[PDB]
C-alpha cells in the first residue's frame, strides 16, 4: 500500500519507452503523470496516466478507497467497464469479468485490462500497455 504509492510517485513526471502495447500505433514514448482527484462521495483519489504515447485511449488508472493489491506490485483499480451506453466491449455491453490492474515493478508501469465479451462468443481480451522508466 504505502510502498506501492511511494514507488509510483517516485516515477511521476519521468519519461520512458513503450515496451509493449495492444495499440501498435503509438509514439514509442511514455510519460507517467499523476493527478489528484475527488470522488463523488468527496473521497480522495490518485489518477495515473501514461501520457505522450499517441494512443487514442490514454492508459489510465484510478487509485482510490476501492483499490486492493493483488500482490505487492499489482493493484486492482477497476472491476467494471460500465459506461453510459456500453462497456469495454463497445455498444450493447457484454463485458464479463472485467478487471483493470496497475502493475509497478522493475521501473515499469503496466496498465492491463482483461475481460470477455458475451455478445461476441465470450472472446477473451487482454489489452495492456507497459512503459519502461
**Contact criterion met (CB below 8 Å) for 87 and 58:** no
Counting the structural domains of the chain, the total is 1
**How many other C-beta atoms can be found within 10 angstroms of the C-beta atom of residue 64?**
16
3-state secondary structure of 9: helix
The resolution, in angstroms to one decimal, equals: 1.5
CATH number at residue 83: 2.40.128
**Contact criterion met (CB below 8 Å) for 87 and 94:** yes
Strand partners, 119: none
Question: In whole angstroms, how far apart are CA 106 and each of 64, 65, 75, 132?
Answer: 23, 25, 15, 8
Alpha-helical regions (H) of the chain:
2-11
Going across the sheet that includes 95-105, the strands are 60-63, 44-51, 29-38, 15-21, 123-132, 108-117, 95-105, 74-78, 68-71
Rounded CA-CA distance 107/61 in Å is: 17
17-39 burial, b if ≥16 CB within 10 A, otherwise e?
ebbebeeeebeeebbbbeeeeee
Q: Hey, what's the cell of 121?
A: 462468443
Locus of grid cell 520512458: 16
Domain span at residue 110 reads: 2-132
Q: Hey, what's the cell of 113?
A: 485490462
Locus of grid cell 505487492: 72
Residue ranges of E strands in the chain: 15-21, 29-38, 44-51, 60-63, 68-71, 74-78, 86-87, 90-91, 95-105, 108-117, 123-132
Amino acid at each position: 500500500g504505502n510502498d506501492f504509492v511511494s514507488r509510483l510517485k517516485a516515477l511521476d513526471g519521468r519519461e520512458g519507452k513503450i515496451v509493449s502495447s495492444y495499440d501498435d500505433e503509438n509514439t514509442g514514448r511514455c510519460r507517467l503523470e499523476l493527478q489528484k482527484y475527488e470522488l463523488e462521495d468527496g473521497s480522495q483519489g490518485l489518477a495515473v496516466y501514461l501520457q505522450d504515447t499517441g494512443m487514442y485511449f490514454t492508459p489510465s488508472a484510478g487509485l482510490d478507497k476501492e483499490t486492493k493489491l493483488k500482490d505487492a506490485n499489482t493493484a486492482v483499480v477497476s472491476t467494471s467497464s460500465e459506461r453510459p451506453g456500453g462497456d469495454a466491449c463497445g455498444d450493447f455491453g457484454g463485458a464479463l469479468g472485467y478487471k483493470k490492474v496497475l502493475v509497478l515493478k522493475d521501473n515499469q508501469v503496466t496498465i492491463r485490462e482483461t475481460f470477455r465479451c458475451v455478445m461476441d462468443g465470450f472472446k477473451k481480451y487482454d489489452l495492456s500497455t507497459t512503459c519502461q522508466f
